[PDB]
Design a protein around this ligand. Structure first.
Ligand SMILES: [Mg+2]
Ligand SMILES: [Mg+2]
Ligand SMILES: [Mg+2]
Ligand SMILES: [Mg+2]
Lengths: 355, 356, 354, 354
């Protein structure tokens, strides 16, 4: 017993080493509260959901729809949310995260336990190399080697992006796992040539080389390229995961709570992938501490062949939590106290709130 | 909140029917909390590859030494350990998973349905099966209930006879009743095509596993050409089977059963695969007593089941090994919402009905 | 003549322990036949354990078969499959015993009952799996002084590949090198691993991915540049047809335990032949009884990939009076009535578990 | 025991003439077996004529087999197929004689050599093909005094459909009505004709289109609302697998002549079973020898569609000492050593061609 009596949200702009986060605080009738985060990148340049539209969905639609409803019935709450609201998975993710945080506090259990239990309490976290200068990247990756790196490419001519990558592989490749992310930039022709070259040089994983508008090409590449392919934008929900797998895609999926609608909702996609023999990867939308740890609790319950990229907090100069997660030796420690394991620093929350 | 499994006990129990052999398990944690579970089948080895004695064997010789000493609150870790060391034996795994969930539910003061994300419904529909082998007897029985869904078992007689049998029941329990049939793998491809066409034509709403699980190809073809819904049973046990069949083009519904998947939580993966693929859901049974039946109901409660459930197993027994049975009424069963499964073991009965 | 009685024992024998389920079937005409159903590591490699196999025989197959005509294998098989789902290991032991007894009754070796042996000497490879590359190479070198099967999949991919590469370079010149991943690899690892294996010259890759992913197995068979051997992916003739129809190309690891016996496995073999799929005489590491039973069946077929019937060579002792003669990478097939081996009652009772 | 001699005669027996190719194989141990290879209409229905069948036996199979061990069917079969392409009719006769002889040597009926009979009495339907509806109905009514096969395809579609329709009306309530188009319909006629046949209650439609169009046969089996029986489209286990993999659903008309003998045909049967294809005991209108040889094989299998082994009933005389017993829509399978039939020397010499 206990219902959701209040839902608050704020658009927070925190300084980066500005990132806009949509923070939510949900209060249950039993006095317990929970927090959640929905963050994206580049306004509307990378996703259809912007911070202001995410805020809007929570305030005008999710709040009145959920207030008064039993707060512990995740399945019933999710059915209601999906039945009354199409898409808007980022907004839903923030809400679902807050619900789990509050429920965990009410039971004295970490979200991971609510999700069936953690397979591990320390998760691997890779580092992305994208300084714009090959020399810097190699240097930065070199200090960390003193074990997995993600290179962002697709913004330059193919020849230059390949030279850049090859340089990094030859310098770091024998001691680290090299992955690249083209984030939809390549057309089918460039994709085929680029992927063949990336595979030939030793790249371990190629992320979303073609547009999500061309899953047919993605499938073809996964069946012809001699290295692993990681689907990102091509797969958001369990429905997408089944569809792409059925179509013949082979490789891995970049799981993201924001694309699926939450720490719990993303698990359906995970199990569908597993059933189809698709590998798993813990993805991010560059969330701050709240959204990152929320994702981590879910990732902890699954075997993640490809690791995770939950380094979002490490890109911020400041966050809205009182205590940040602890990162060390290419890993992040998963809190195991009640709920998410982090708390809202109200002073910082107000300081960074947009308006 | 946390504890390790200290002991695991199991008994083969033979209970009288209106005997059905149940494999009951009691798992004891280091905090003193106990959880119970049930693994039951039909007709020894005639319907499945796991018999009551082999199930008992799997629990005693393999699952027990594998799980004792392990944290009992971490179902994901325990499941990975179980599947990593034990191939198949989903019936045995289901009894253990059920007990683990029962115990952690009691530990959190929550019903299993809540541990599974929450119940969408706390009262579930339960149809009745007509399988007396006599058309007249079946109609009478069904007539009594109509004073709403019936599952007719066929496939034991010549096609013409089974079709006349079903047609008679359809005419009699006409308007106010959903008629489903279960051939349980009995038909060859040719007989199945003819039989299924006739069944669809007479108004049957669902045809369960018309052909052999050795011929999923035929099952898929039938689901694409037959003018009524097809329900897969033996053709789908785990989420892996579920994905494969759907990818192959099967359209219709899946008969979810905790025994086939490995428990109340494990079966949920199959359910999600089905949902992602547009395949309907049905709450199936292996004719479990009260323990296995309620374990299944807790899982079924968290899902939208278009085809309802067939959890009438307890109603076929003259006695069970629980202190208090579930309450059935008006084509439904009430789902307990107390901590754990909501049912308690009656030790006096347990010992009385134990085989040895 | 009818089946009058069926006895079974779980026997734990010492290795260089292996648990065998031995069966003795008694016909109404005084003739007895023996059979064996053995697996590896309890329930770690298959769904049928020694105790579950014993249970199937004692509680279900015995009461089902007692009183039935013992010479009608077709009728007996139909009855068994009609009343018993799966449990192919138990059935294999029973079918073996029926054939052994039948052969004795007719004064013919089991191979003759199965239509006649094409050869009486079968090739037997050796498996290198000490976990140590240097040891494996040494051991294989001692034999070349010519087919080896390497077990991998228990370590990081790079390690297993380096391990296999070292063995191929040292023994590859004069020996067929095959590997067995026994379902260990996920799809991505499988693609990379298989390509690397093919590139280094491995002749056959056995069950690289999980039986839960026949789609991956099919894909790999169509793209990898070396032969793929299906094991767990194919047990019965039904599986054999399905996988072939799906597009799998390569070979099948025939095992009497997976199919239900020396005769039952022949149906899978014919389905494979019809589909252009190669054959391999597989084992579950059976003792002398189950090994010779498999051998009689294998003798009747063209086995492109040979056999791995070296199970008895891993035992310090067995429950038979006289073992099979292994020599020069081959094993001699007995041609006396029945299986050609007899149960040593003292050892049987000595090694019986209960 | 080796094959010492092989004799063969082209025999022309009177009908109610049919040309049979009879074989007698003598083993070094004095035991002999007989076989039969028969066809219909010279070369109008198959590629193997009685004279070509005789030639294959005399000029090729005989020198190939003489001197070889007579009890190893597998070895003999590999030798025969390795040296001779096709010519399954000739091989069937030789294989039958080998089994007959082996059975006598072991004191077992051929069915037992094939693993055991599931039944010793098999259903036999009657073919109505007088070309006249009235005559067909009369003959059918006389037999009902359980299953009929109507031959059609030689006339206009509307003519054949009205014909079958009349027969279904007259005999349909007391018997299973099947039709055989024997490859006569083009694809368009087949679609229209098969839909009409299904709608009027026909239980099985045999080979409606040409074997040159398996694609059409597959399409029809997937859209027609009644069972389809493949005949010319499937002869060997290879054909059986290919057609099944292509998507064909229905049944196969097994024939020892098409596969190469009572044993050889079993591989096709197992492939069909593995793929979920039903079985039917087919005939080329063999006399008693060829017919009983088929029956022994059919007895070991579950035949959902029965058999059409009525060949002997069309003859005024045969070359056997004692004919099979047909009664109550069935035929009795002899269970004495070998085939269970003996060659009648006088009748044999009397009917030998030249
Ligand atoms: Mg992306
Ligand atoms: Mg069933
Ligand atoms: Mg294996
Ligand atoms: Mg024909």
């Amino acid at each position: 017993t206990a219902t959701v009596e209040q839902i608050e949200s704020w658009i927070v702009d925190v300084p980066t080493i500005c990132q806009s986060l949509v923070i939510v605080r949900l209060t249950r009738s039993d006095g317990i509260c929970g927090i959640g985060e929905a963050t994206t990148i580049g306004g509307l340049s990378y996703g259809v959901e912007s911070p202001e539209a995410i805020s809007s969905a929570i305030t005008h639609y999710l709040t009145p729809l959920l207030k008064g409803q039993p707060a512990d019935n995740l399945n019933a709450l999710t059915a209601r949310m999906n039945g009354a609201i199409k898409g808007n998975t980022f907004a839903k993710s923030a809400i679902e995260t807050a619900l789990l945080d509050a429920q965990g506090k009410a039971l004295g259990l970490p979200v991971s336990a609510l999700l069936g239990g953690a397979l591990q309490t320390a998760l691997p976290v890779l580092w992305t190399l994208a300084s714009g200068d090959t020399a810097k990247d190699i240097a930065e990756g070199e200090k960390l080697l003193a074990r997995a790196f993600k290179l962002k490419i697709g913004a330059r001519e193919l020849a230059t992006d390949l030279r850049h990558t090859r340089a990094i592989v030859e310098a770091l490749g024998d001691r680290a796992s090299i992955r690249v992310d083209v984030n939809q930039a390549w057309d089918a022709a460039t994709g085929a040539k680029g992927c063949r070259e990336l595979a030939a040089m030793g790249v371990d994983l190629i992320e979303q080389p073609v547009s999500a508008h061309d899953n047919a090409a993605l499938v073809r590449l996964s069946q012809q390229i001699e290295t692993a392919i990681l689907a990102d934008e091509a797969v958001a929900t369990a429905y997408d995961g089944y569809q792409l797998a059925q179509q013949g895609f082979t490789g891995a999926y970049a799981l993201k709570i924001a694309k699926a609608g939450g720490p719990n909702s993303v698990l359906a996609l995970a199990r569908v992938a597993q059933a189809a023999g698709i590998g798993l990867y813990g993805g991010t939308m560059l969330e701050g501490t709240v959204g990152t740890v929320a994702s981590l609790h879910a990732w902890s319950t699954l075997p993640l062949q490809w690791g995770t990229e939950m380094f979002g907090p490490l890109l911020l100069k400041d966050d809205i939590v009182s205590v940040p997660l602890t990162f060390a030796d290419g890993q992040v420690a998963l809190p195991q106290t009640p709920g998410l394991g982090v708390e809202l620093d109200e002073d910082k929350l107000h300081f960074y709130t947009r308006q």
